[PDB]
């Protein structure tokens, strides 16, 4: 579904195209930026569904007199634990949608889900209680026990089915009638799921393999060589 295959302009986009790595989490393990959007729809994209949230107009006062940029909020998500928001203003509503999907496909972050008191059968919701702010709106996330279907407003209802989480209790402080700043306040919580130092992660680790230095003089070539 290329339909025309595109050149890797960045470094590790070539390694993706070279087949140097088949692990999307290997990018997440060393926290190096996915910079071009053609990276992840090679790794993912098999009917990976997204839906627009919020395309309400945004104006600016000029001399003759008021011109509109339509700002879009799109939300893309893997149902096995990846998430993204799209934030892009444009001229008209078609390129507002399509322009943010690239931004949605670049902000894709893994989701840590887990257990609460019972280590039985496909880790479900959240390992702990997390929250995240952006502009007065905080959203704590509570690990709900099994089969306790989503307890949130419709803006993180459609967002947390896209996150690989079974169920949730949530308690959203703030002005959540701003339907775009509500969505971005959930992500600072879910991005903290791989930032909470549980005692599940107190061993040292195999330290990583350094994908630069491990695949170094196989990039001493000057060619953009694929398979």
């Amino acid at each position: 579904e290329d339909s025309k295959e595109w050149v890797p302009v960045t470094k590790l986009g070539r390694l993706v195209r070279e087949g140097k790595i088949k692990s999307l989490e290997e990018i997440y393990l060393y926290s190096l930026p996915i910079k071009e959007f053609e990276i992840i729809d090679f790794f993912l994209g098999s009917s990976l569904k997204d839906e627009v949230l919020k395309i309400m107009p945004v104006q600016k006062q000029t001399r003759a007199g008021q011109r509109t940029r339509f700002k879009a909020f799109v939300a893309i998500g893997d149902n096995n634990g990846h998430i993204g928001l799209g934030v892009k203003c444009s001229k008209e509503v078609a390129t507002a949608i399509r322009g943010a999907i690239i931004l949605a496909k670049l902000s894709v972050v893994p989701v840590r889900r887990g257990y609460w008191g019972n280590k039985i059968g496909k880790p479900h919701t959240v390992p702990c209680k997390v929250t995240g702010k952006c502009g007065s709106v905080s959203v704590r996330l509570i690990p709900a026990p099994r089969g306790t279907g989503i307890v949130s407003a419709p803006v993180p209802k459609k967002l947390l089915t896209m996150a690989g989480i079974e169920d949730c209790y949530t308690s959203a402080r703030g002005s959540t009638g701003t339907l775009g700043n509500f969505a971005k306040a959930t992500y600072a919580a879910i991005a903290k799921t791989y930032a909470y130092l549980t005692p599940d992660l107190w061993k040292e680790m195999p330290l990583g393999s350094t994908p630069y230095q491990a695949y170094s003089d196989f990039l001493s070539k000057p060619t953009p060589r694929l398979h």
């Binding site: 609460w116 690990p143 909470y196 549980t198």
Partner: protein, 129 residues
Amino acid sequence: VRMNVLADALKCINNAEKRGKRQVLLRPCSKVIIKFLTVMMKHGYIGEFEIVDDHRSGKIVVNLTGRLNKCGVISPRFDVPINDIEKWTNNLLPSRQFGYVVLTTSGGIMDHEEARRKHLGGKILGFFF
């Protein structure tokens, strides 16, 4: 003035680990607070601390790892029986996987996992996870 030694040596721990120091100086080490760290020492969170013995009140120079997230005190020391011990683990601790609420039960200073098997109740002394 210091209406708690336990607050003025647990925020002093917690303020010095969010900056990531490796040693905290606490003052002035009531034997209430030594057996609070000894609960935290034997669950990994705290290194082997040292009590400098000046004959005024004491000082401790407490080593630590960096596994701590929020190690505060509850005040005032609410008397908690055994049947309402889980209303104070639900709304306080992050998940029932880990974390502790430390109690001063009738036997000693202990956490909420050892007290619910030994079947003791007491006052809430603080919390750490």
